[PDB]
Every structure is written in C-alpha cells, then in structure tokens.
Amino acid sequence: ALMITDECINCDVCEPECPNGAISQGDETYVIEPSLCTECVGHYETSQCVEVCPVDCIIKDPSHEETEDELRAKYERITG
Ligand code: SF4
Ligand code: SF4
C-alpha cells in the first residue's frame, strides 16, 4: 500500500485517478485506505496517484509492505 504524507497540498487531482476508490479527503490531507490500495497492480503498470501528484507526496507505507503477489491478491479480492 502507498500513503499520502503531510506535504499534500489538497489539490484533489489524485482522487479520481484511483481504480479502487482508495483515496478520500481527510481533515488535514488526502488519505489512502490501505485495504483498497493494490499499488495499482492489476490495472496499471504504475501507481496512478503518484503519476499525477504535483508535489511528490505519495510514498510506500512502511506499515503496509506488500509484495507484487499480495497486491495481485488484493486486486483479485477487490474486483474478481
Ligand atoms: S495529488 Fe498529491 S497533493 Fe494532490 S491531493 Fe493527491 S496527494 Fe495531495
Ligand atoms: S496506488 Fe493505485 S490503488 Fe493505491 S491509492 Fe494510488 S491509485 Fe489507488
């Protein structure tokens, strides 16, 4: 899973880009819901939210280290 850090400028651009609806508006920043973030494995070759973030604040979430296989597996439980 990835996480949006405190440097988020609340620009709204990454929200609509997530295939799993993992990103939502927070009180201070946008937040990714880790159970929904597959790091875009299964849909795209790269993270879509990272691709559009204007200030490079989405990074790997150290408390949710998943392999290409667990992301794949997550992609599979979220979609079919
Ligand atoms: S794109 Fe980046 S700066 Fe904009 S809301 Fe999403 S995480 Fe924050
Ligand atoms: S990496 Fe993909 S699934 Fe995770 S929040 Fe970003 S767009 Fe969504």
With DSSP H G I counted as helix, E B as strand and the rest as coil, what are the percentages for the chain, rounded to 5? 30, 15, 55
Residue that the structure tokens 């997530």 belong to? 18
Which residue has a Cα nearest atom 1 of ligand 1? 53
Please count the CA atoms within 13 angstroms of the CA of 27 that sit on its side-chain side.
0
Which of 32, 43, 59, 61 for mutating ligand 2's site (highest number of atoms within 8 Å of CB)? 32
How was this entry determined? X-ray
Q: What is the resolution of this structure in A?
A: 2.1
Residue that the structure tokens 């875009």 belong to? 40
Regarding the beta carbon of 41 and ligand 2, being less than 6 Å apart is answered: no
Distance of CA 29 to the CA centre of its chain: 14
Bridge partner residues of 24 (DSSP): 31
Q: Which residues are annotated as a binding site?
A: 8, 11, 14, 18, 37, 40, 49, 53
Number of domains composing the chain = 1
What CATH number corresponds to the domain at position 57?
A: 3.30.70.20
Q: Which domain holds residue 43?
A: 1-80
